[PDB]
Amino acid sequence: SVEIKRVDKHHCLDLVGIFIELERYYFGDKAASEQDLANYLSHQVFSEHSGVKVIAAVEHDKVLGFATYTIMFPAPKLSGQMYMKDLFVSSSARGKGIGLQLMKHLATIAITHNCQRLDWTAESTNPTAGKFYKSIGASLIREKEYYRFEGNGLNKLAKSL
Amino acid sequence: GMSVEIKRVDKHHCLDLVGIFIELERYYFGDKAASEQDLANYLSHQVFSEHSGVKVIAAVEHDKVLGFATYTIMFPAPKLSGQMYMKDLFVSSSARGKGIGLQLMKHLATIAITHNCQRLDWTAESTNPTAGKFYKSIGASLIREKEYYRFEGNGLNKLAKS
Amino acid sequence: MSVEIKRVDKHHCLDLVGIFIELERYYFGDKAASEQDLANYLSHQVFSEHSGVKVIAAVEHDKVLGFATYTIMFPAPKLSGQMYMKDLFVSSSARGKGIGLQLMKHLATIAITHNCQRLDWTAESTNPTAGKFYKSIGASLIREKEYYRFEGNGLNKLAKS
Amino acid sequence: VEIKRVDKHHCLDLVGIFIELERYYFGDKAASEQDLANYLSHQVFSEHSGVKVIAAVEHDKVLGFATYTIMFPAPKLSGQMYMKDLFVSSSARGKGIGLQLMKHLATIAITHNCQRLDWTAESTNPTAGKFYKSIGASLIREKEYYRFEGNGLNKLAKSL
Ligand SMILES: [Cl-]
Ligand SMILES: [Cl-]
Ligand SMILES: [Cl-]
Ligand SMILES: [Cl-]
Structure with missing residues (x-):
């Protein structure tokens, strides 16, 4: 079907x-x-x-x-860490579990390419996503801190080279 | 030339x-x-x-x-751009105080802006407070809204099989 | 449209x-x-x-x-690349659909997203309509540029001597 | 050398x-x-x-x-080689370095099916023109060089 x-x-x-x-x-x-x-x-x-x-x-x-x-390195146990940048389901396909099917498929690629982890992020201002993720068995890694340079901050750093 | x-x-x-x-x-x-x-x-x-x-x-x-x-550079991202992501920064303990960490990141930042990225992102561990201070000290921002999720080992296999 | x-x-x-x-x-x-x-x-x-x-x-x-x-050429000023368009060709059976210009809009976009500050190319003075088209879309003619060439025998001699 | x-x-x-x-x-x-x-x-x-x-x-x-670089398409089913830059250290002046680099390019050109080696010079740098002519190069007068840059290049891109 899909x-x-x-x-x-x-x-x-x-x-x-x-x-x-x-x-x-x-x-x-x-x-x-x-x-x-x-x-x-x-x-x-x-x-x-x-x-x-x-x-x-x-x-x-x-x-x-x-x-x-993407698959990133290095990672524990001599393996890859898969990272999902974006997941997106058309409003027109809603209610069909498309997102779950996409993530199952990603999970399949991970194991055939020696990844022991599949990671991604969500926004806390989009609590729906987290609920969905938690509902499918995902673990939230609270120790993880997310940092970023952007815009002018990113430029100043580059220019300081 | 230069030593390092x-x-x-x-x-x-x-x-x-x-x-x-x-x-x-x-x-x-x-x-x-x-x-x-x-x-x-x-x-x-x-x-x-x-x-x-x-x-x-x-x-x-x-x-x-x-x-x-x-x-690596990840897509999609806002403004039709890429998002650079640094998986690991590692400096040998014997090379400490040579400013290698910052040097490596300056090069990363330069690659980023010459390859249509407007962000350079990465993670640190709360159990490793020193990394957090270092990053903030060079002017990095903490994105408190981001939530980090994971499947691994058996949970990953279950997800794939099901 | 369908193009x-x-x-x-x-x-x-x-x-x-x-x-x-x-x-x-x-x-x-x-x-x-x-x-x-x-x-x-x-x-x-x-x-x-x-x-x-x-x-x-x-x-x-x-x-x-x-x-x-x-192609994108190096080096060039300001630690950047210089894009060069070798050929632009539009079929006689597809004239009037603004295809030439659309192809150039794309190139320009590739140039600026790949650290180029220039898009350069040549035309023939014996093909006046090309130059007119180029000026009309805002291109500058670089009169100080001199174009040199070794070809055929002269090329074989240069390499052989 | x-x-x-x-x-x-x-x-x-x-x-x-x-x-x-x-x-x-x-x-x-x-x-x-x-x-x-x-x-x-x-x-x-x-x-x-x-x-x-x-x-x-x-x-x-x-x-x-x-x-x-080598560019396509070009006449006679071949490549056109293009030299972007030639630079000789001032500390190596008078050794014929520039000429030696170009003969080498020519060798690359003929072994990769290029019938042409092309490049440009600035007319505000007449010594460069004179040098090129002196090693056998032809000036192609009919060639017009066009460019978009800076803000002009941006405006073209933004009209996409
Ligand atoms: Cl989200
Ligand atoms: Cl290699
Ligand atoms: Cl032409
Ligand atoms: Cl010159």
Whole structure:
């Protein structure tokens, strides 16, 4: 019924529809145009310097949701740590458990590529997500502290080189 | 030139990281640190592999590695940009007070802004307060809203099977 | 509209055979290369370990309407790259759809997201309409630039001496 | 004096000569050593770079370099080689280094099916023009050089 597959570079534009939806959801009026996103997809998301791969859930030739993930090193027990950057399910596919299916699929990739961990973050201002994550058996790692340089802070650091 | 050099480490020279990795394994895992032979395979077959998403830079002096960082660029992110993420920063205890950690991060920041990233992110451990102070001291921000989730070992296998 | 701009990679390089056959007629008429020669050229040269260019194309109904080849050169001022467009070609059967300009909008976007402060290219003074098009989209003619060349025998001699 | 390609594992061998190039063109605005090491490591030598770098070395010192790319399509089913930069250390003047680098490029050009080696010079640098003509190069007068940059380049990108 609903298939999950990895999207390769030759089909990256198949993701445009769903990224537009993601853009509108997260940024509203500041959402990027379709040509912007096509360019972003072809030369950034699917560039040589991109650390992520992309999987997508497809039903009747339409994308219902996607996740991006990377495998990082080093990690405990001589293995990889998988990290999911984004999980997104179309409002039009809601109620079908798409997100769970995407995460089960990610879990499958993790074990076949010697990862013992699948990690990701959520926002505390989106308590729904955490409830969902907790409901599917995920553990919240309270000891983890998340740091960031950005905008001008990031620039000042770079310039101090 | 300069005494301490920062350079990329590529697949062809990955075994140059064996010394520093032994030191890292002892730090994180004490008793359970991996052997030299196992670290060499880890490096050659996993850290530098088709499925690996990280790259590595290292601080080098006198042909010994004093510290390294692994990093990757993740998508999507706001403003049609990338999000750089540093998986590990590790500096040898013998290279302490040489400002290697900051040096490595300056290079990371420069890579970030020349490769369409507007963020550089990473995590630290609350059990390692010293890291937190160091990061805040160089002007890093703590993102208190972020919640870190995980599946591992058996839970990961259950999730995959089900 | 139904026109997509996409990257062409090595695995799909033969998609360019049709538009290369057109480009060959346009510049060389009867001295145009055969289809077989162009497939070999695309497979063994244009996409090759020694090739310094990438390719984006405008495609509609699985037909290539136009393409641009480009590369990023170093060094250049301000610790940045310099993008160079080798060729821009739009099929006579796809004129009036603003495809040339759209291909350039994409290149410009790749340049600024990959630390380039310049997008450069050349035209022929014997092809006045190209220069007019370029000025009309805001490009500057760099009159101080002098273009030099070794070719054929002179090239063979330079290497041999 | 030996001429050979610098690969990524040795890109930092070029710091010295790059520093000199920066002083020579940008005077006080010259980038620092670390800036240059980072530039070489992650841009000049990156998967998105179109250039390779050859260097002339004598007694383990870099005396000069050239960067070049090979572009397509071009006439007669071949590549057109393009030299982006040629630089000779002032401390190696009078040794014919510039000429030696170009003969080497020519050798690369003919073994990779390029019928052409092209490059540009600045008319405000007549000595460069004179030198090129003197080694057999032809000026292609019909060539017009166009550019978008800075704000103009941004505006074009933003209209996407
Ligand atoms: Cl969230
Ligand atoms: Cl390698
Ligand atoms: Cl023209
Ligand atoms: Cl010049």
